[PDB]
A = this chain, B = another copy of it.
Amino acid sequence: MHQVVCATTNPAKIQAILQAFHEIFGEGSCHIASVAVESGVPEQPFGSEETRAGARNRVANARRLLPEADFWVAIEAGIDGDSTFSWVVIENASQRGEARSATLPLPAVILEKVREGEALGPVMSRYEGAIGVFTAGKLTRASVYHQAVILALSPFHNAVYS
């Protein structure tokens, strides 16, 4: 089996990573474990680049802490000038794979409130993630993370990426 380390202790993300990894490498061919590391980025990353940078920082930290594993993966959430989304970064001994998730346009009021100091979690909590509430249940956070992990997994099963 492949030893896959997830730089997150969130069940939704853990679930998506496992599913995505099993779909590409085969059912039951992967063992997943979590490691809690620093993102070197603010709790609520702003902008595509900063959110992705955190994902990368988490992978580097996880990779150094557990050098025995085969894969290191992170999924970092962040907000835009009008939306929320996340970045998936994957690494193994040889290469890296990165992918940004689908975007969720956010209510004007919700946006200005997080732009005033509060984290999205609190503004939504005090008000599955936000995806579930706005897609009337038709989509789950795990469901969009999943597609993202599968995409960033591309380089690892296509020799063309060299």
Contact = CB atoms under 8 A, between A and B. Distances in A.
B97 A100 contact: no
Contacts of A152: 105
B151 A105 contact: yes
Contacts of A144: 102, 147, 151
A44 interface: no
The copy count of this chain in the complex is 2
Interface size class of A (residues with CB under 8 A): 35 or more
B139 A147 contact: yes
Contacts of A102: 99-102, 144, 147-148, 151
Interface of A: 23-24, 83, 85, 97-105, 107-110, 127, 131, 134-136, 138-139, 143-144, 147-148, 150-155, 157-158, 160-162
